């Protein structure tokens, strides 16, 4: 089975009645990385089942096609926290600067998992506009949100991060990391 | 854990109450490829849960053991479209000529996903009896069915396909492909 | 995405409402192998959904951190057979001798799948205390339990196994195996 065959087959399987088969298809298309799946998966972002929407968003992140930026920014407002997580991470992996301001807003999402996801996505994008919000997130009441904000700050780097550089131990290791 | 251990364990897990665990087991046995799983997975083709039946059929396709041909041809008549998809593809990957006529019939299945799956399976088998039906499928009302029929025709190749060689663009690229 | 990011993200996803997303997270952490996930997955061993508990136990087996021994021995008493399977195998992969006596008891679990799982885990641990029980398991009414006991005996090896070495064909191949 050539990869073109797989893509056509798994794209067609996005219309199967079982939500599990649709999510497995969306995940498969993500692994292959063929851009023929982008618009179909963008449509899958409106699937009735949240599991399908999360899989489609996660797959679009793998493919890394900028066409999915605006739909995934719309997906950031999904009712299901799992979907907002995948949308956030998928936007980080895509790396398009357009996702920064919607992600900064996601950084105050009520769901701490979404906040964690929002923190990491900003680190992947690397836009310096995320430094200040990420430092405020180092004060988050949820420990895992803080850890995510620290890792994201390290991923950005840059002179501005060096300037700004729990929070004490992060910068110390960051500064020692920076010198090394 | 040696692969023999895995096979015995995942074969035993085909009897767990959770349909998800049974499908995950069937999928695992498919990845290992040990033929000890063939008859158990042939039995799994009658599992109550369609997800299990699709996983067992997909796994049998991976193993490529001709013992699964007749049961999978029976699986082609399954009530659940996802199961008929896996049965069709599994028969294509197995490549046994016995599956041609049942697959040609599947090429007119009401479910377009099944038709897509039927088209690709015939391309994998490579039997020239599928040329004429596949050309009629190039006129399918569903675009993805046509694309599948074109790819399948290219996979068969052969002088007869060259003789016969949307439809216009397929043969042109096919003929230019053929010369190159 | 650096592996530290993934770990923090998938650890955070152990709190998503969808049991599927929690199990997928637990499985992901298992593949990465980062020990930051051990205590979170130990907590996941009490998840309401059996699928999550089985995934967390299976992931802990992959990580191989001895901290999971006592919780997984407690997991061996889980109401759901799939969970007891994963707990048993996870203890085998961890290889801690403390799991031998609880596994020997699991070898008489009413669920034959659990017995299969218990047999293999003892083979992975290699503790000679399992020889006698494993030989009695060669008389199990379930064929797959016997096959598992034979493979486990071969994995232990040792002079004591050589001393002791369906059952006839196992030792013959074992003795011929031993000489070769």
Numbering used by the authors:
A (entry chain A), B (entry chain A), C (entry chain A): 1 to 165, 175 to 189
Original paper wording:
Four of the designs that were trimeric and expressed in high yield, 1na0C3_2, 3ltjC3_1v2, 3ltjC3_11, and HR04C3_5v2, were selected for solution small angle X-ray scattering (SAXS) experiments. The proteins exhibited scattering profiles very similar to those computed from the corresponding design models, suggesting similar supramolecular configuration. Structures were determined at resolutions of 2.6 and 2.3 Å, revealing a backbone root mean square deviation (r.m.s.d.) between the design model and structure of 1.4 and 0.8 Å, respectively. The structures confirmed in both cases that the designed proteins adopt the intended trimeric configurations, and that most of the atomic details at the de novo designed interfaces are recapitulated.
We sought to develop a general computational method for de novo designing protein nanoparticles with geometries tailored to present antigens of interest, focusing specifically on the prefusion conformations of the trimeric viral glycoproteins HIV-1 Env (BG505 SOSIP), influenza hemagglutinin (H1 HA), and respiratory syncytial virus (RSV) F (DS-Cav1). In the first step, we de novo designed antigen-tailored trimers, featuring N termini geometrically matched to the C termini of the viral glycoproteins. In the second step, we generated tetrahedral, octahedral, and icosahedral two-component nanoparticles by designing secondary interfaces between a designed trimer (fusion component) and a de novo homo-oligomer (assembly component).
